[PDB]
Amino acid sequence: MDTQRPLDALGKSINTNVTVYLKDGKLVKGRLKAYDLHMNVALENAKIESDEEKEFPMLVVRGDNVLYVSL
């Protein structure tokens, strides 16, 4: 919420549920454990709206795939 570091908002959501929106249209929801200046994120217990059936204990998402993150 400092006016020059929009990614501070991901720091203020560490260990909360977030929803990462990818460019292809996928949605990955999970517990945000980490992020970096590329917008790579570590998501704990992640689920994709798409496949439903499968759950991912730990998922690491390459930041250049990212549309936006809903905090």
Nearest C-alpha neighbor of 45 from the set 9, 18, 65: 18
Q: Using CB under 8 A, pick the residue from 17, 29, 31, 42 that binds a copy of itself.
A: 42
* Enclosing H/E stretch for 64: none
Please say which residue, 39 or 48, places its beta carbon nearer to ligand U5P.
39
Q: How far apart are CA 68 and CA 59, in angstroms?
A: 17
**Residue 20 CB, nearest approach to a copy of itself (Å):** 9
Please report the DSSP string for 8-19 in residue order: HHHHTTTTSEEE
User: Which residues make up each annotated binding site for UMP?
Assistant: 38, 40, 62, 64
Residues that bind a copy of itself (CB under 8 A): 1-14, 22-24, 26, 28, 33-36, 39-43, 56-71
